[PDB]
Amino acid sequence: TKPIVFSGAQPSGELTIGNYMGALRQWVNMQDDYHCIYCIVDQHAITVRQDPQNLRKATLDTLALYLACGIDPQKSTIFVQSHVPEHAQLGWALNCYTYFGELSRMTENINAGLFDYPVLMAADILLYQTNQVPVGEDQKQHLELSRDVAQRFNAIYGDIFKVPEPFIPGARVMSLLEPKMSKSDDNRNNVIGLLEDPKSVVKKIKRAVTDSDEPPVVRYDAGVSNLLDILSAVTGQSIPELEQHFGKMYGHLKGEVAEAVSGMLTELQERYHRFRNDEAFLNQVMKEGAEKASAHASKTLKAVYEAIGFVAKP
């Protein structure tokens, strides 16, 4: 049994080139070393009012994109959250072991889902005996609540849950017009999406901030440096060996980058469309993932219900 890694994927989330070359490209190559779990959290998504048609479409978009990146439905467990009842069941039970004050510290006319979703996050992770969690900086507090709830529950009932640990990377990709590239960027021009057409990549790379050194030379030190990090990650080349290739101006660099990133995204995107348009295949993937997820999750939930004192479902 390998270490279990759990990651949540927002249905509306837009994966950037930073998300891919930095983290997800490595995670794909390590699916034989870890039991990786990817949960498309549509129950977390409806804490914000959602257009139903866009929610359904975005869930399928996200599934197809992760499959396009190489997530293997048989090696890993990839599923839609609402297809696995155990998430809501454990979410309710852990409400009774979470303090109202803890949720208040997470930050009226908000809905109860926004207030309570940190408990559902804890259930998402603890269901699968998760060992490690890749947490963004924005999610640090949520992960520490999951640890505190797991320890509190185990102190009462015994070692039912594993106490999850945050996990660390690692290609560095910086925001183009402000050299870290983030999927949360309020400025779209700072990032390149995985579903970005070649023309828009060319336009964002050409417009990337750079330093007006005279004469313009290619050297790692913040604009020019970003393009060296991005190009090196795509081509697997050393930064200095790249500088050997560039006498050329910053326009040579920006052109070279844009061509490489678009070459890599094109291979990802054709896989994306082949999976995305095959709705029957996606239904099979969600069925396999949900059934595998529930089999694993029910082992933990039934031990939780046993310890709480519920009559076991006959």
Binding site for a copy of itself (CB under 8 A): 42-43, 46-47, 49-56, 59-60, 80, 82-83, 85-86, 88-89, 91-93, 95-101, 103, 108-116, 119-120, 157, 283-284, 286-287, 290, 305, 307-311, 313-314
Amino acid at 246: F
- φ/ψ of residue 146, rounded to 5: -60, -40
Per-residue DSSP letter, 86: H
CA distance 201 to 189: 10
Spatial separation of the C-alpha atoms in residues 39 and 4, rounded to whole Å: 13
Angle between helices 223-235 and 250-276 (to 10 degrees): 50
User: Per CB under 5 A, which of residues 167..206 are in contact with Ca ion?
Assistant: none
- The residue type of 199 is K
Question: Running DSSP on this structure, what letter comes out for residue 37?
Answer: E
User: Which of 113, 134, 45, 33 minimizes the C-alpha distance to 81?
Assistant: 45
Altogether, the residues listed in the chain come to a count of 314
Nearer Cβ to a copy of itself, position 50 or 139?
A: 50
Backbone angles phi, psi at 250, to 5 degrees: -60, -20
Determine phi and psi for 220, rounding to 5 degrees. Answer: -80, 125
CB of 71 to a copy of itself, least distance (A): 17
Binder of residue 217, out of a copy of itself, Ca ion, none (CB less than 5 to 8 A by kind): none
Tell me whether residue 96 or residue 168 sits nearer to a copy of itself (CB atom). Answer: 96
- Which of 32, 33, 72, 270 touches Ca ion (CB under 5 A)? 72
- Judged by CB under 5 A, which of 26, 32, 56, 74 binds Ca ion? 74
Asked whether residue 236 is marked as a ligand-binding residue, the answer is no
Nearest distance in Å: CB 284, Ca ion = 12
74 binds, among Ca ion, a copy of itself, none (CB under 5 to 8 A by kind): Ca ion
Alpha-carbon distance of 291 to 29, in angstroms, equals 24
Are 205 and 254 contacting, i.e. CB atoms less than 8 angstroms apart? Answer: yes
* Smallest distance from a copy of itself to CB 49, Å: 8
Q: Which residues pair with residue 39 across a beta bridge?
A: 8, 79
Residue 74 or residue 277: which is nearer to Ca ion going by CB?
A: 74
181 assigned ligand-binding residue: yes
Residue closer to a copy of itself (CB basis): 106 or 171: 106
Choice between 91 and 179, CB closer to a copy of itself: 91
The site partner of 100 among a copy of itself, Ca ion, none (C-beta below 5 to 8 Å per kind) is a copy of itself
Choose the contact partner of 99 out of a copy of itself, Ca ion, none; CB within 5 to 8 A by kind. a copy of itself
Q: Is 82 annotated as a binding-site member?
A: no
Q: Please, are residues 94 and 119 in contact by the beta-carbon 8 Å criterion?
A: yes
Annotated binding-site ranges for Ca(2+): 72, 74
Binding site for Ca ion (CB under 5 A): 72, 74
